[PDB]
């Protein structure tokens, strides 16, 4: 086509979605991790994670307001990944990299799994 | 902080939200324009438009599944702006610029209003 494109549009949309999350506006699901609860928007979770995409396209699960993750999932690792979903920023540190990579593998967030693998390989 | 950032994350999120819109997945509102109906996600509409942000933060309207726009709004102008919200791409043409600018002013999409004003000024 002959469209023009606003370079900062996608980033501005994501910043506003994160502002809605902060203020708990139109959040439609609670993700439960080892008795730690995280409110989010189903559409953002689906756009970022192969696992949530599969969950919320299921005819029965699409209607659930609460999702319980596998008990092996670390709440801090989940929190870091939820922040990444809404900001593009990943708080990757020596002390959390193993939990973050394990959580990203479970959530099916291929780009996060890739950078964790590379950061681990650099330290060996 | 000491975060790393994935450059293409915001664009990838928006592309996936547009794929959900195309497949009518988790759309939670119908926007009615001169008897033309457009399904969308409330959160994406709020992230892009000052008008929808005001509508869906209202305690009564946040619960509506149908929103009727002012009868002066042109369905094609709305369609072009809805496409822009989900893609960052604006199909601005000599034949639609007046309807697009009028719709963007009503929806409170300041960056679109800005480029329409500049494109009109260049043709005078």
């Amino acid at each position: 086509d002959s469209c023009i494109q606003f370079t900062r549009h996608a980033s501005d949309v994501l910043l506003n979605l994160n502002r809605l999350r902060s203020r708990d506006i139109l959040t439609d699901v609670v993700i439960v991790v080892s008795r730690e609860q995280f409110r989010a928007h189903k559409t953002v979770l689906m756009a970022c994670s192969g696992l949530f995409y599969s969950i919320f396209t299921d005819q029965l699960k699409c209607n659930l307001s609460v999702i319980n993750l596998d008990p092996e999932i670390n709440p801090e690792g989940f929190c870091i990944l939820l922040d990444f979903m809404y900001t593009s920023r990943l708080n990757l540190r020596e002390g959390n990299i193993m939990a973050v990579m394990a959580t990203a593998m479970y959530l099916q967030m291929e780009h996060v799994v890739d950078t964790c693998r590379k950061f681990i390989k650099a330290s060996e | 902080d000491s975060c790393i950032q994935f450059t293409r994350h915001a664009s990838d999120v928006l592309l996936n939200l547009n794929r959900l819109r195309s497949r009518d997945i988790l759309t939670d509102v119908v926007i009615v324009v001169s008897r033309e109906q457009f399904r969308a996600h409330k959160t994406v509409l709020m992230a892009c438009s000052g008008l929808f942000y005001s509508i869906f933060t209202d305690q009564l309207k946040c619960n509506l599944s149908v929103i009727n726009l002012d009868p002066e709004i042109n369905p094609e102008g709305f369609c072009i702006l809805l496409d822009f919200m989900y893609t960052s791409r604006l199909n601005l043409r000599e034949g639609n610029i007046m309807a697009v600018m009028a719709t963007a002013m009503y929806l409170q999409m300041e960056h679109v209003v800005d480029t329409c004003r500049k494109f009109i000024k260049a043709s005078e």
Binding site: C3, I4, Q5, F6, T7 | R89, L90, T115
Partner: peptide
């Protein structure tokens, strides 16, 4: 704004 840019030409994509």
């Amino acid at each position: 704004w840019v030409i994509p």
